[PDB]
Design a protein around this ligand. Structure first.
Ligand SMILES: CC(C)CCC[C@@H](C)[C@H]1CC[C@H]2[C@@H]3CC=C4C[C@@H](O)CC[C@]4(C)[C@H]3CC[C@]12C
Ligand SMILES: CC(C)CCC[C@@H](C)[C@H]1CC[C@H]2[C@@H]3CC=C4C[C@@H](O)CC[C@]4(C)[C@H]3CC[C@]12C
Ligand SMILES: CC(C)CCC[C@@H](C)[C@H]1CC[C@H]2[C@@H]3CC=C4C[C@@H](O)CC[C@]4(C)[C@H]3CC[C@]12C
Ligand SMILES: CCn1c(=O)c2[nH]c(/C=C/c3ccc(OC)c(OC)c3)nc2n(CC)c1=O
Ligand SMILES: CCCCCCCC/C=C\CCCCCCCC(=O)OC[C@@H](O)CO
Ligand SMILES: CCCCCCCC/C=C\CCCCCCCC(=O)OC[C@H](O)CO
Ligand SMILES: CCCCCCCC/C=C\CCCCCCCC(=O)OC[C@H](O)CO
Ligand SMILES: CCCCCCCC/C=C\CCCCCCCC(=O)OC[C@H](O)CO
Ligand SMILES: CCCCCCCC/C=C\CCCCCCCC(=O)O
Ligand SMILES: CCCCCCCC/C=C\CCCCCCCC(=O)O
Ligand SMILES: CCCCCCCC/C=C\CCCCCCCC(=O)O
Ligand SMILES: CCCCCCCC/C=C\CCCCCCCC(=O)O
Ligand SMILES: CCCCCCCC/C=C\CCCCCCCC(=O)O
Ligand SMILES: CCCCCCCC/C=C\CCCCCCCC(=O)O
Ligand SMILES: CCCCCCCC/C=C\CCCCCCCC(=O)O
Ligand SMILES: CCCCCCCC/C=C\CCCCCCCC(=O)O
Ligand SMILES: CCCCCCCC/C=C\CCCCCCCC(=O)O
Ligand SMILES: CCCCCCCC/C=C\CCCCCCCC(=O)O
Ligand SMILES: CCCCCCCC/C=C\CCCCCCCC(=O)O
Ligand SMILES: CCCCCCCC/C=C\CCCCCCCC(=O)O
Ligand SMILES: CCCCCCCC/C=C\CCCCCCCC(=O)O
Ligand SMILES: CCCCCCCC/C=C\CCCCCCCC(=O)O
Ligand SMILES: CCCCCCCC/C=C\CCCCCCCC(=O)O
Ligand SMILES: CCCCCCCC/C=C\CCCCCCCC(=O)O
Ligand SMILES: CCCCCCCC/C=C\CCCCCCCC(=O)O
Ligand SMILES: CCCCCCCC/C=C\CCCCCCCC(=O)O
Ligand SMILES: CCCCCCCC/C=C\CCCCCCCC(=O)O
Ligand code: NA
Length: 389
């Protein structure tokens, strides 16, 4: 069948994807720009990721359409339009890895996050990652390419000029680069590192939540021990365990006030215990319950609510990392079959184009994930569209 027919379908789908990638990710950038509640280090990497996806629509998809025609081109010019998308994919990987690491720092050492993770450092890291993305993605332009071995019969059949080749991705980009360097080293390894970071994030969240409820249980258990104690020494033992835990749990004004009352009331009871005044110590310790109800439970619940939101933000980020993998793995896997199985028939052209458009679909999906999973984005999206569009 005439190639322009299947080409028309491929090109039309690509153009549709390009429109959606531009519109959705422009909206992401506009939201971060407009809403100061969205201006944090995490979302600067989100913006860098949206910028890469905007350039997929503006440049990479037009380049992909061009290289599907096999037009006559100087080989290194053909190389650039083939490889530019690798720059954008690599930048996306760096942004996704940075987002994961940022969220791990926030959950594991929240006390030093704001001093460690600053806007100026994020902007410098983003700049560095874009430079490294060009070096990685344009590495074929430094000489790891097939321009030295042009397909002269294909060039002559298409009427190409001297020094020109039919511009086709797999004719100019070496497959060993795509499999060993681009896929294994530059894509697979960072994605696996991301998985490890997310596993540590969720394990850290689970441990901290367990410790909060466990510390609550230890506090309440020890009150019962004091109540049903029969000498002052048993009261002393339990209060000593309560006092060390209270100082451990203190590590905002009513928060500090609540713990000041709590530690003071424990010291009050411990002093009576050490005088052998059991009944007064048990009565003194009952006062702790008023402090527990008015203060400690509010701190516990707020700490629980903060940790659960951190789980929610890490899950949303992990979904976006997983969707990148889901959209890009088929094309990489196909390249692995082409490279490792020369006895296998090449994947058919229709499947090649399905795998290409699928990888381009990833530049559409993140704005939807933010809208459905992050209220602050969803509300900002609403105000921008309603008050303008
Ligand atoms: C800043 C942005 C908007 C500029 C975009 C520039 C792009 C479209 C330009 C820059 C380099 C250009 C390529 C440079 C060399 C060649 C080899 C020639 O035989 C065919 C055209 C081709 C393949 C060009 C296509 C267009 C190209 C990719
Ligand atoms: C969830 C995602 C990551 C899974 C992706 C699996 C896809 C990419 C796999 C599953 C089955 C695979 C195909 C199985 C058999 C062949 C025949 C061979 O002559 C060319 C490759 C080809 C056509 C494979 C291409 C890649 C393929 C389509
Ligand atoms: C964590 C996971 C997603 C890592 C990615 C899995 C990749 C590297 C695996 C999954 C399926 C694998 C392919 C399965 C079968 C064949 C056919 C064989 O004749 C050559 C190797 C080849 C082509 C494998 C190459 C590697 C491969 C593509
Ligand atoms: C992830 C990077 N990457 C690729 O690895 C890739 N590999 C191909 C090959 C396509 C093709 C193969 C055989 C053909 O005809 C026998 C053919 O005719 C038009 C096309 N395109 C790729 N693209 C998009 C530019 C990409 O972006
Ligand atoms: C994760 C990253 C991948 C780590 C392991 C990658 C190891 C791949 C090496 C291989 O199978 O090469 C054999 C050749 O002789 C085939 O031609
Ligand atoms: C708006 C549209 C971009 C139009 C894209 C123009 C590119 C069409 C060239 C073409 O169809 O050729 C494909 C190949 O040669 C086999 O059909
Ligand atoms: C705001 C965005 C600014 C604009 C962003 C850039 C626009 C992208 C358009 C096209 C890439 C395709 C260009 C490659 C076309 C090559 C066709 C060609 O040169 O064929 C001649 C002949 O084959 C040689 O001998
Ligand atoms: C070809 C490369 C094109 C663009 C890079 C665009 C990167 C997008 C810039 C995002 C950085 C950001 O939004 O944060 C900076 C801010 O100054 C922190 O305080
Ligand atoms: C993703 C959205 C839907 C994708 C649908 C098909 C994309 C292109 C696959 C078929 C292109 C033409 C096949 C051919 O004749 O070579
Ligand atoms: C909706 C998308 C409009 C895309 C139509 C232009 C592509 C036609 C393919 C072609 O004729 O080469
Ligand atoms: C897919 C993306 C949906 C985009 C909805 C259109 C509104 C955003 C466009 C814009 O703000 O410029
Ligand atoms: C093509 C790439 C298009 C990028 C789209 C993202 C633009 C987002 C806004 C950045 C600059 C905003 C300046 C507009 C006016 C500022 C204001 O009124 O507050
Ligand atoms: C080409 C793609 C252009 C996008 C550059 C980034 C656009 C918005 C960045 C500044 C606004 C913000 O801080 O969110
Ligand atoms: C602001 C948007 C920037 C992109 C504008 C261009 C939109 C995409 C247009 C078509 C891609 C180029 C197709 C050229 C195919 C060349 C085939 C040939 O010369 O034989
Ligand atoms: C920015 C984009 C590229 C700058 C100019 C690149 C031209 C060199 C490759 C074309 C060629 O020599 O065949
Ligand atoms: C080789 C590298 C060639 C030039 C590529 C570097 C482009 C850097 C683009 C801008 C960085 C934006 C982050 C700034 C905050
Ligand atoms: C090579 C790594 C990229 C270094 C150049 C980017 C500037 C560094 C910076 O912005 O702090
Ligand atoms: C990262 C650095 C990119 C180097 C790209 C240089 C482009 C030169 C094209 C080679 C040529 O003209 O023969
Ligand atoms: C594939 C090419 C790989 C290139 C490896 C060498 C480039 C690495 C360069 C340095 C990365 C960090 C740069 C630090 C910038 C300055 C820091 C600062 O001034 O505070
Ligand atoms: C500076 C970082 C790398 C140097 C890039 C310049 C190499 C030029 C492209 C190679 C070529 O012309 O064939
Ligand atoms: C190859 C690994 C696939 C999963 C990568 C995504 C990382 C986030 C997972 C949760
Ligand atoms: C995760 C780690 C992924 C690495 C997977 C192994 C790929 C090995 C492919 C080797 C196939 C060799 C084919 C042959 O012997 O001809
Ligand atoms: C997640 C990653 C899933 C990887 C998908 C692997 C799918 C099945 C591999 C089947 C291999 C096909 C052998 C073809 C034999 C032949 O063509 O001669
Ligand atoms: C979704 C449609 C494609 C899904 C994978 C099925 C396996 C590949 C499809 C047929 C190609 C096999 C072949 O003819 O070599
Ligand atoms: C979207 C789901 C798959 C779309 C498949 C596109 C092409 C179907 C097979 C084409 C063919 O057999 O020639
Ligand atoms: C052309 C096909 C475009 C598909 C990309 C659409 C992230 C999914 C939106 C669902 C709500
Ligand atoms: C590739 C796109 C696959 C489906 C993801 C769509 C999710 C957007 C709505 C939530
Ligand atoms: Na991307």
């Amino acid at each position: 069948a005439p190639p322009i027919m299947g080409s028309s379908v491929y090109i039309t789908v690509e153009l549709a994807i390009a429109v959606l990638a531009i519109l959705g990710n422009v909206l992401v950038c506009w939201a971060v720009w407009l809403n100061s509640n969205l201006q944090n280090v995490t979302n600067y990497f989100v913006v860098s990721l949206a910028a890469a996806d905007i350039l997929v629509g503006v440049l990479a998809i037009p380049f992909a359409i061009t290289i599907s025609t096999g037009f006559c081109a100087a080989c290194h010019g053909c190389l650039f339009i083939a490889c530019f998308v690798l720059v954008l994919a690599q930048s996306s990987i760096f942004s996704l890895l940075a987002i994961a690491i940022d969220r791990y720092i926030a959950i594991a050492i929240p006390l030093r996050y704001n001093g460690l993770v600053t806007g100026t450092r994020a902007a410098g890291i983003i700049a560095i990652c874009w430079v490294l993305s060009f070096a990685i993605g344009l590495t074929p332009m430094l000489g790891w390419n097939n321009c030295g071995q042009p397909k002269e019969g294909k060039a002559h059949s298409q009427g190409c000029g001297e020094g020109q080749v039919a511009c086709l991705f797999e004719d100019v980009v070496p497959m060993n680069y795509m499999v060993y360097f681009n896929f294994f080293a530059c894509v697979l390894v960072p994605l696996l590192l991301m998985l490890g970071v997310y596993l540590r994030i969720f394990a850290a969240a689970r441990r901290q939540l367990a410790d909060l409820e466990d510390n609550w249980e230890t506090l309440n258990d020890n009150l019962k021990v004091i109540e049903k104690a029969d000498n002052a020494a048993q009261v002393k033992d339990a209060l000593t365990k309560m006092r060390a835990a209270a100082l451990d749990a203190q590590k905002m004004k009513d928060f500090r006030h609540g713990f000041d009352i709590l530690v003071g009331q424990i010291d009050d009871a411990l002093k009576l215990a050490n005088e052998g005044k059991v009944k007064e110590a048990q009565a003194a310790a009952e006062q702790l319950k008023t402090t527990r109800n008015a203060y400690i439970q509010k701190y516990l619940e707020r700490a629980r609510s903060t940790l659960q939101k951190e789980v929610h933000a890490a899950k949303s980020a992990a979904i976006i990392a997983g969707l990148f993998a889901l959209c890009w793995l088929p094309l990489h896997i196909i390249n692995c079959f082409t490279f490792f199985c020369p006895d296998c028939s090449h994947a058919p052209l229709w499947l090649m184009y399905l795998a290409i458009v699928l990888s381009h679909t990833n530049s559409v999906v993140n704005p939807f994930i933010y809208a459905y999973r992050i209220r602050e984005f969803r509300q900002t999206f609403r105000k921008i569209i309603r008050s303008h569009v």
